[PDB]
């Protein structure tokens, strides 16, 4: 299957004397592995998964220096945007970036990503060709022209096709055992009267990674109506939780089954209300 | 390793 690396960066300007807050988070296959935060007592990139302990001090020092450069880049970019949009001095504004690569199991780049948002709206993005830009509004046309003129896409392309790919591959080799780790969901169904109707709620607890699917069915057909799902949520101890519910007739509860699909399981779980 | 931006916006 594929693999991915992403860096998600945010800079938030602050109306008083403070410089913008700058945070950068790296992910490999959607697992956080490094983080930098300008508000930390000692602002530096830090490992966030145990396999990043293979990197020497040079790695951390130079990545930290890179973040310090990004911090200035974001500061200037925020100030420039303030002018482009004619915004007043004493507000707070958010610039975000997503960058990275998707890599096949043959180590071929499938897609590179380099895009930005301002105030929660898409701003500019590098096209799939890694050569041209899509700009969302008037301000972003200014940026687009500046980057076309300076040849910025060529430099991003080099990062995406070279460094992004090569480092992802190194991280996957060092992180393999950790990246394969799973914790299986523990599941059960609860019963909650609701008018001759009851809510059946199928719980999945203590699972890792977060990816999971819960389904309800009746008489071999998967349900969609009368259904409620909560967003998958952290327990706070590194594992996750989720539930899914259906509203059913009083007296027919046992006819309904919940299925839990998760990569940790040797096969999907099937369960029923069992009072 | 992280990306690094070139020209400012």
């Amino acid at each position: 299957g594929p693999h991915s690396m992403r860096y998600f960066e945010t800079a938030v300007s602050r109306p008083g004397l403070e410089e913008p807050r700058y945070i950068s988070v790296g992910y490999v296959d959607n697992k956080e592995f490094v983080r930098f935060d300008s508000d930390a007592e000692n602002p530096r990139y830090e490992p966030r998964a145990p396999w990043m302990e293979q990197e020497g001090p040079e790695y951390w020092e130079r990545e930290t220096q890179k973040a310090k450069g990004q911090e200035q880049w974001f500061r200037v970019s925020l100030r420039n945007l303030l002018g482009y949009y004619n915004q007043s001095a004493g507000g707070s504004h958010t610039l975000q970036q997503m960058s990275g690569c998707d890599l096949g199991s043959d180590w071929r780049l499938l897609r590179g990503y380099l895009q930005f948002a301002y105030e929660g709206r898409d701003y500019i993005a590098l096209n799939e060709d890694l050569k041209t830009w899509t700009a969302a509004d008037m301000a972003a046309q200014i940026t687009r022209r500046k980057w076309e003129q300076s040849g910025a896409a060529e430099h991003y392309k080099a990062y995406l096709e070279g460094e992004c790919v090569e480092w992802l591959h190194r991280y996957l080799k060092n992180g393999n055992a950790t990246l394969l780790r799973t914790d299986s969901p523990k599941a059960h169904v609860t019963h909650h009267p609701r008018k001759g109707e009851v809510t059946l709620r199928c719980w999945a607890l203590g699972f890792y990674p977060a990816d999971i699917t819960l389904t309800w069915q009746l008489n071999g057909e998967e349900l969609t109506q009368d259904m409620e799902l909560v967003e998958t949520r952290p327990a706070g101890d590194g594992t996750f939780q989720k539930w899914a519910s259906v509203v059913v007739p009083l007296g027919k509860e046992q006819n309904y089954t919940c299925r839990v699909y998760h990569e940790g399981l040797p096969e999907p779980l099937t369960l029923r209300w069992e009072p | 390793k992280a990306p690094f931006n070139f020209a400012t916006m």
Partner: T-cell receptor
Framework: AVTQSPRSKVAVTGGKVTLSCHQTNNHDYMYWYRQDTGHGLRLIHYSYVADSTEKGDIPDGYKASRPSQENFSLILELASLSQTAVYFC????????????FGAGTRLSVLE | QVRQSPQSLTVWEGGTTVLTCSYEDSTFNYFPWYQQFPGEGPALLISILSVSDKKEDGRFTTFFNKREKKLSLHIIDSQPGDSATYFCAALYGNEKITFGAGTKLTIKP
């Protein structure tokens, strides 16, 4: 544009010297470099934003001032014979790999 | 970290000038050359990324050799107006540029 002032300076040992640089690039980064008998470009001080400065590789004997975005000055409080050299100011955009735009240089001789 | 020799070089007008540089840090991935005429400041001449072997612009070609950590600048049909000091330079990522000591080139007939 990046323009330096003066074009040339002759100072006495122990005298005060200020070299000035003015840029119209609206660039956040400014730099002062030293060149010796036409070789090298050694970074003395630089600045990432108006109203602050950072030590470069060879700061000793020099100070810097960034009073505005457009201006960056190099200050020698007690000029020494060893500071006879040519000094170049530059600007650049913030970020990575942004081209340095240099001024035309200031030649300094420090005399007894 | 960036080693540039010789200090000065003369080559005949019409000849091809070969300027070379080496570097220590194998992670360096951007290599701009700057040209500096007498009485003037340096200015960007040509640059190359480590993904490429060469970059050509008119009479000037830079070649990059990752295995040997070597760069060079070739100038075809070298002419008097190419007389200048050439600085090789190198950096990784968004780190600050490191310049070589510069080679002073004189083109003579």
């Amino acid at each position: 544009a990046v323009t330096q002032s003066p074009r040339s300076k002759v100072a006495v040992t122990g005298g005060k010297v200020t070299l000035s640089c003015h840029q119209t690039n609206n660039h956040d980064y400014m730099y002062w470099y030293r060149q010796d008998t036409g070789h090298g470009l050694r970074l003395i001080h630089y600045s990432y934003v108006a109203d602050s400065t950072e030590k470069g590789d060879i700061p000793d004997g020099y100070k810097a001032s960034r009073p505005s975005q457009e201006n960056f000055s190099l200050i020698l409080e007690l000029a020494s014979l060893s500071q006879t050299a040519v000094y170049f100011c530059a600007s650049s955009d913030a970020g990575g790999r942004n081209t340095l735009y240099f001024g035309a240089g200031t030649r300094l001789s420090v005399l007894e | 970290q960036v080693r540039q020799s010789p200090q000065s070089l003369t080559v005949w007008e019409g000849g091809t000038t070969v300027l070379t540089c080496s570097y220590e840090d194998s992670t360096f991935n951007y290599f701009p050359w700057y040209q500096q005429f007498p009485g003037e400041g340096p200015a960007l001449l040509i640059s190359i990324l480590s993904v490429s072997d060469k970059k050509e612009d008119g009479r000037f070609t830079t070649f990059f050799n990752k295995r040997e950590k070597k760069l060079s600048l070739h100038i075809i049909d070298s002419q008097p107006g190419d007389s200048a000091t050439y600085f090789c330079a190198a950096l990784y990522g968004n780190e600050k540029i490191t310049f070589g000591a510069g080679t002073k080139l004189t083109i003579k007939p």
